[PDB]
Amino acid sequence: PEGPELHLASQFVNEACRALVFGGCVEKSSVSRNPEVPFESSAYRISASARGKELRLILSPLPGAQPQQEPLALVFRFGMSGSFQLVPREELPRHAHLRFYTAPPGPRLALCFVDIRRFGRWDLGGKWQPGRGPCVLQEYQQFRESVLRNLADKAFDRPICEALLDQRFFNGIGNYLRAEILYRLKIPPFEKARSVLEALQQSPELTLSQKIRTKLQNPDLLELCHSVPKEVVQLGGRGYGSESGEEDFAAFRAWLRCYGMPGMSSLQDRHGRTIWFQGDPGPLAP
């Protein structure tokens, strides 16, 4: 999954859970190879945030809850089939591998991490993955600066379509977004990454008037690494976790200009991931 989905999933969790009280233990399926979550509280609130391709839950005991329990953070990576679902307690999905149950009063519900393929992962603690860079959606200025300061890194000797998947520098960008972003600027996917980005490197250097004149109609690649996934977010509304998936995917399908589209070219990169593009593949093409 890519950054827009993580963000939209966090939004869903937070808003669905804002007034719910959970209670008891956190239950893992026997089959899941992820870690048991040691946690017990009579009354706790669940909140979420996202950063790139990760989602962080925070489990926060409420006043007077027993036994004593510190807040506990958990960071998820969904994999191909992971999701969060809020379901009636008697309707637990088959492949609900981690579950949180509401306490009374009110209907008996379960927040579930669901994942048929079992490629999703969680770890104990709030820590984001070591080395994953700033989120392209939520941390744009730090993301941009981390790329520009580090352009001498060997990551930028690679073709731009491969560098766009390096999560140290483009946390949140995956295979559909790299296609869409490079297509907007018609940058060949196998141009050398540093050659594409060099001209951006060394705010209130240029004034707003000067940026309106020269930059507004000419967004750069790092700008688009933020704005293109923001389009998907806006498009997603509050559909995550609801019954609107058929309408939502039809809208997504219509939004794509390049990925998987008729007439576009495709090649395999060094990791066997398919890059979609129009026109010249660039000099470093296989």
Description:
The protein is an alpha+beta fold and 286 residues long. It folds into two domains: 132 residues, Alpha-Beta Barrel (N-terminal domain of MutM-like DNA repair proteins), CATH 3.20.190; 146 residues, Helicase, Ruva Protein, domain 3 (Orthogonal Bundle). It is 28% helix and 22% strand. It contains eight helices and eleven strands. The strands form three sheets. It has a five-stranded antiparallel sheet. Strands 2-7-8-6 form a four-stranded antiparallel sheet, covered by helices on one side. Strands 10-11 form a two-stranded antiparallel sheet. α1 crosses α7 and α4 packs across α7. The chain starts with a helix and ends in a 9-residue tail after the last strand. It is classed as dna binding protein/dna. Keywords: DNA glycosylase NEIL1 Fpg Nei base excision repair, DNA BINDING PROTEIN-DNA complex. It forms a monomeric assembly. Crystal Structure of Human NEIL1, Free Protein. The protein is Endonuclease 8-like 1.
